[PDB]
Amino acid sequence: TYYFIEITIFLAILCTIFIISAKNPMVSILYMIALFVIAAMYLYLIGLGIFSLLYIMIYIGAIAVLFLFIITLLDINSTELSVKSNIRDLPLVLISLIVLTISGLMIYSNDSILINKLLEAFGNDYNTIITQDWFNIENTTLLTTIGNVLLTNNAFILLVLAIVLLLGIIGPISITMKHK
Amino acid sequence: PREAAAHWVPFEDKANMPDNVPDVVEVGATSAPLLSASYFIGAKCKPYNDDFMLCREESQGSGAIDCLKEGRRVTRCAVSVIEDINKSCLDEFRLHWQCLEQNNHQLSGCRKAEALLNKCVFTKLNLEKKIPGLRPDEEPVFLKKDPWIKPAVDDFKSVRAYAEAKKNGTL
Amino acid sequence: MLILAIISLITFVSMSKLSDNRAIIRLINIYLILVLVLDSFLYLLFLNNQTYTVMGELLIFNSFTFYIDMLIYFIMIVISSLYGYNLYNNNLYKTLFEPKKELIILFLINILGALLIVHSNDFITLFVAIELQSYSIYLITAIYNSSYKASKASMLYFFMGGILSILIAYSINTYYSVLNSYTLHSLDSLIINTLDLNLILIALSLGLLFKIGIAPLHKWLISIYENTPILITIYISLIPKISILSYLVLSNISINSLVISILAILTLLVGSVGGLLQIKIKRLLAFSGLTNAGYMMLLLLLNNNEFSYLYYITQYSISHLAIFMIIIFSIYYINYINNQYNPIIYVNQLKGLIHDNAYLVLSMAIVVFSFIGIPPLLGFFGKLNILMSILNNGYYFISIVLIVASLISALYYLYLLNVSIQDKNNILINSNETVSSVLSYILSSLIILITFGFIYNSLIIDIFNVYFN
Amino acid sequence: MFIGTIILVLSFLGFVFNRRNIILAFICLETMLLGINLILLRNSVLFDDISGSLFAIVIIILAGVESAIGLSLLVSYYRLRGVINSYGI
Amino acid sequence: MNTFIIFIILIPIVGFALLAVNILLAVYKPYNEKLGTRLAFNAAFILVAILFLPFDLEISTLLPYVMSIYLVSNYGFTIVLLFLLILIIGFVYEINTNALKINKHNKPNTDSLIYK
Amino acid sequence: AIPFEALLPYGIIFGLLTAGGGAMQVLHVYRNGGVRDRFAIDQWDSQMMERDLRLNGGQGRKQVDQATAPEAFKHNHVWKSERPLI
Amino acid sequence: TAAGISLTGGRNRCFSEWQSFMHCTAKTDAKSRAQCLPNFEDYMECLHHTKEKARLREIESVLKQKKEGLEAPPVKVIPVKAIGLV
Amino acid sequence: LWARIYLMPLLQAEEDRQTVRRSIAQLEREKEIMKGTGFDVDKSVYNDGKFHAPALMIPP
Amino acid sequence: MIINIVEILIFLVCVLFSVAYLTVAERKTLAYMQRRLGPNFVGYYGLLQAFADAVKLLLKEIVLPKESNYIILVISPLITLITALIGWVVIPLGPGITLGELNLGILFSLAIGSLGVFGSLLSGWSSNSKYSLLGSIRSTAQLISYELILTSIFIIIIMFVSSLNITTIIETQRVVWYCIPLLPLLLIFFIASVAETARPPFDLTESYSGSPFVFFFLAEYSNIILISAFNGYLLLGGYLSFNYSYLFNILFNDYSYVSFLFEGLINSSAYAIKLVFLMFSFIWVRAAFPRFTYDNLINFCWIILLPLLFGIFLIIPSTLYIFDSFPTL
Ligand SMILES: CCCCC/C=C/C/C=C/CCCCCCCC(=O)O[C@H](COC(=O)CCCCCCCCCCCCCCC)COP(=O)(O)OCC[N+](C)(C)C
């Protein structure tokens, strides 16, 4: 049970390709819900069990529900993935795939050197040593510290965020009412 | 400080202390005896423990190696407290931490055994259980009569010993 | 005190009827005036470039940012006067210049999000404020929803703002992955030498800059500015420009960058020669904004660029504001009103404007020659003080490209003049109803600033010398 | 960093070469935000701090609000045109 | 290897088994008679699920606070008070505007009977 | 009055959940070795449980109380080596 | 801010190197910053472990080519079932 | 809470001695690995002279 | 490994029997409320009738219409079956007796309850008819609208415990239950629980064959007992009846397997008697009341219950503030 992270990486690739090539618009949206589940798997896998259920609650249970709710009672035309339509795209898809992929891998590195910048992204092989220290006396888990720092050090960010939630109330109402 | 996830595998080390540092014998008490005698370890070994953590504060970052000589003495003084409490109060110390291994190691559920243990240790080992930072006009929690938080089931050996200490006049 | 206005306002607007909207805006207009007048004495806090950080190194308040918030309030007073006052009392201008119920809500929320960018110190304050102002521009674009062009423009602006917000988020977390930090106060003159922060900080600046309309990605914004109605587009052209550029000028993370110099050369080129053969007045008017944002991308390369910036900002703001208000006024004299949201489109529709209200053409000529940079007017000293910073700091090819770009851009500025001073067959003699006293006084104030504002240059340089040094 | 980088890149290119409908563009936007989340939360775990977790919990809320705003924007796009084209807006 | 994951994998085994039992067990035998544009909708239908999400995002924003409630005592309390009241003001916007109503288009036609 | 037939399927629901809870409690106590479960475990108490598994010798929560620790206790100490996190 | 706050609310893993670098940067003005280059280096490889990855690759390159391998007090791996077995 | 901080230095001295022993063991181990080949294993990669536990071991 | 799989198939046999007999119980008490007998035709006193119905409906013809996604239409039953059943882990039948003791149990119980909306909405896209869509729209709109106030009541209750562990809440409720101070919240939570299953007090959209029917059927009553379990742990006492320390000091003398057996019997008998009274009240409110228009329902949730809930958000931390009573982790 070593290669779990590699498996989630591969399954996420495959799920995005099934997102962007799908018969029916909501077959594509169910593949997105599956990608959210693969994400939450990776987040529990890395050690963040809190966030995975936050993803399942907020992204799956509200955003995907809103999205499916939109696709139901609105009319959306769709062409399917013809080969006549989209292999005119493929040479720039290949060039931009390799370039954007390498370039996203580039900025984790500090060299003057171009491909020493690149292959330090693959210098991964060393197993981190986890030590126990007995300095912490209480059950401050991660949600507790998020609640301490949203509320003391970044209280202003929480209140500007309240203004953003207010805007998310006012705006959709203001569009779709047709006042008398 | 962070905990291991995503396929940690445990490993241990076939080695020894170097000759530079002397032998120190270890604490062999587990969590219920350690939690039982925590306040008496803290009552006797307060200046030793505080000199050890003051060492760790004073020479920052060196840490481990420059504070070994007092990490020796905190372990030895706690071992002294634990064998002291064994040879005087073995049966009710055992009564206490055998209560404590049920009830999620909650100190809230073992009041009638800890009254017996505090009385023995205070008259024979002459160490008192105190909670600091508690100003007056505030009652300590393990002294109060009819607390709101009672355990599910009181242990049978400790309520029997508590009643027999009532009728002996021990307590 | 914006927060007070929003909190008061949506409470008050939910209970008003739609008959009261215009009067509500008048109330807010006067409110903002007394926030300028009764509360600007806070400039005394910022003596000798004393800088504060507020909310735990979260917001940064210096005198630069104080000037920027004063400028944003002045412009909001002008724009809210344009919504809250009638042009004429016809049954025509009531069906043309009509505010929605929730328009001033979104205005004040956007002014809030625009202030929390310039006043920002950390990256999550920057992010949250960028999305606050971005959602507000989405909804200000989409609020006149009985219009095909504005609906299509709001959808386009949603997707093109979403990409360039995810690029900012990628750059921020990419900066976090190499430095356990959020501040650019972390940088402090030594880290930049021993660390390659070039790709990070330049990708940050680029993701911030493509929302202004810099040159490879300019056409989508020109289409949004042509498709929105004429009152909305004077606000959404100005406010993200001055907020995002006032962030990127205060934070000097692209000093002597080759990419920003490439895109500044390209911006000056494609804005000058892009709007030459164009026949719509908002198109013509938006490529002017493209060039004048290029002149700011120039100052992004600079260290210590706060005079040239702030002068050319209030220059461009007054000139921009006045040239949109003049073509609001020319709608009374055109022979053809289409398109209720956008009643004047083609620039040949103002053709006989010297024979009907010649002093509107005097107004127009003044602000157009200040766009060109003619020395008695205020735009000249803006271009002059930009050149004094470009040449001081070694950008010699950039200087000649600036000069050629201004010469090419003078053609389509003067095309407005060339159309308006011309013969027309049927001229006005006698018109019964009058333009708004309150609202033509604003245009005259904006002209008198442009023409007679060179008087106060030495006063302004001395007050500059004390509060920023 | 690999999973967040590749979901962001593949999500971006699926957004760019979308010619088939409009809601693929919405869901590619949301999966881009997911990939940004993945990269940041990994960095927070590796650096032993909450501040990446702070920016991640804030960008969750901002992604939700942008979905609500933009889908009301699509509904108003649809009000006057009772059809959504396949080629795009 | 806990008793948590046998559940996660075993509930599908339950389902896969039962719909197998029916598909394996019952008659198919269909035919034509057994087998077998777009409508418009009111604004409150789409409105309930669009405005649902900003309240849901607030409810899970309280979730970091109510776990940290002891540590931020007297201070995070007031920050949360201000947060809640800022969102209560947008809610009183929403119910003052009568947004979520679907209201009936035909009245008793109140207008009176006048003559000549 | 009271229909016994109406409340008998409630009686079987009650009996099934009662017998399930009782059988499950005895299964938990048999797993622990005669004591109750720990229903809320800290990071501190997680580290304390692994330390006591190290000290007692093999057994789960045998809970030795000894004066001074054994000989193999100084040598059976564990670090955890976690994989690259790709 | 949340400058040095960890997941448990304590100080993060590289807090002490960062606080040493800030102790450096507090008592220095510019023109004199070239001397606190080592502290910053100590911070950066605290973050990313670049020099330790280089060093461990240099030592693993040598232990791969030995027929002898390891003549040392070795390290044992256990299953999680057997932390304190013997 | 006061019980746990009475217990803290007692276990901290423990894990400190375990850290010192296993780190000096690993140091001597890679010294016994790279005998012959001229290479400094005692040298820290950190520029400060403070002691540090090693990390990032090769998987077994 | 023998231990945990025998434990989990004991838990599965208990809960999947008890969701079957809940059906037999609702028919019988609906009958006696209407002054007639329930079923007595199929068992000795009417029992194993849910078995008779399941035996017959696993013999029933499945019709996949002209209009339909076939795959979507038969795995929407399973995704609603599986997430209506997955939430049965975290409920305790005693202190620490769950199928998985995780310290974030309410976050899990709250995340699984939001996964249950899809098999309504998604299965509207099955058999795409213009009336087969907007009925699912009204269904999912009501569903999300009432899980809002469900989540709200949860977060109000966690203001007293400050822990997302579930048996920690029940051990916290030993001093007093949470219905006794917050009895309006018991009324609000009961009606939100009735709405969240779309019970026929709060039903509008009612007003397949075989496997897609029996999966929806089992998911309905598993949701019944699951939200009843949520009510039982965070609002009533979970497994708590009385002290029972004095009775044990009379009866027993030391810890034996019969004493743990007796204690588990008492704890899960208390939990089951809460749950059984709650399911009786579900059927009892089904018997007595007509149904709702969609507008009465949306007006009810968004205009009546939610402002009152905002008032509760303000009032309860303020009284935890006035007396310096903040709960510690
Ligand atoms: C009761 C008064 C209430 C407050 C009124 C404030 C309104 C804000 C309006 C902004 C747009 C209108 C232009 C006004 C320019 C003001 C110049 C100035 O003074 O800005 C200063 C220099 O600006 C700089 O570097 C560069 C600034 C460049 C200015 C270039 C335009 C020149 C011509 C127009 C300005 C002169 C008009 C004077 C007409 C009598 C920098 O900030 P300060 O802390 O010293 O501000 C103090 C102003 N107080 C005292 C009125 C608050």
Residue numbers in the entry:
A (entry chain 6): 5 to 184
B (entry chain U): 2 to 172
C (entry chain 2): 1 to 469
D (entry chain L): 1 to 89
E (entry chain 3): 1 to 36, 48 to 127
F (entry chain D), G (entry chain 9): 2 to 87
H (entry chain W): 63 to 122
I (entry chain 1): 1 to 207, 219 to 340
Task: Please share text taken word for word from the publication where this structure appeared.
The strongest impact on activity with residual rates below 25% was observed for mutants L42ALYRM6, Y43ALYRM6, and F89ALYRM6. Residue F89LYRM6 of the accessory LYRM6 loop forms a prominent supporting structural element for the TMH1-2ND3 loop. Density for the β1-β2S2 loop was visible but less clear precluding modeling of side chain positions for H91S2, P92S2 and H95S2. It is remarkable that a single mutation affecting a contact point of accessory subunit LYRM6 with the TMH1-2ND3 loop causes structural changes in three central subunits and over a maximal distance of more than 50 Å. The mobility and structural displacement of the TMH1-2ND3 loop segment observed in several independent mutant simulations is in agreement with the cryo-EM data on the F89ALYRM6 mutant that showed the absence of density for the ND3 segment involving residues A37-Q47ND3. Eight of ten mutants of the tunnel showed decreased complex I activity below 20% indicating functional relevance of the tunnel. CAVER analysis using our model of the F89ALYRM6 mutant revealed disruption of the CAVER tunnel at position of the β1-β2S2 loop. Missing density for the L211-V212ND1 segment in the F89ALYRM6 mutant map precluded its structural modeling; however, simulations supported the existence of differently populated conformational substates. Taken together, we demonstrate that a single point mutation in the accessory LYRM6 subunit has a significant impact on the energy conversion reactions of mitochondrial complex I. Our high-resolution structure of mutant F89ALYRM6 and MD simulations show that structural perturbations originating at a contact point of LYRM6 with the TMH1-2ND3 loop propagate to functionally critical loops of central subunits at the interface of membrane and matrix arm.
Complex I is a redox-driven proton pump that contributes ~40% of the proton motive force driving ATP synthase. Electrons from NADH are accepted at the tip of the hydrophilic matrix arm and are transferred via a chain of Fe–S clusters to the ubiquinone (Q) reduction site close to Fe–S cluster N2. Q reduction is coupled to proton pumping in the membrane arm of complex I, at a maximal distance of ~200 Å, which is remarkable at molecular length scales. The LYRM6-ACPM heterodimer binds close to the functionally critical interface region of membrane and matrix arm of complex I and two adjacent loops of accessory LYRM6 interact with central subunits of mitochondrial complex I1.
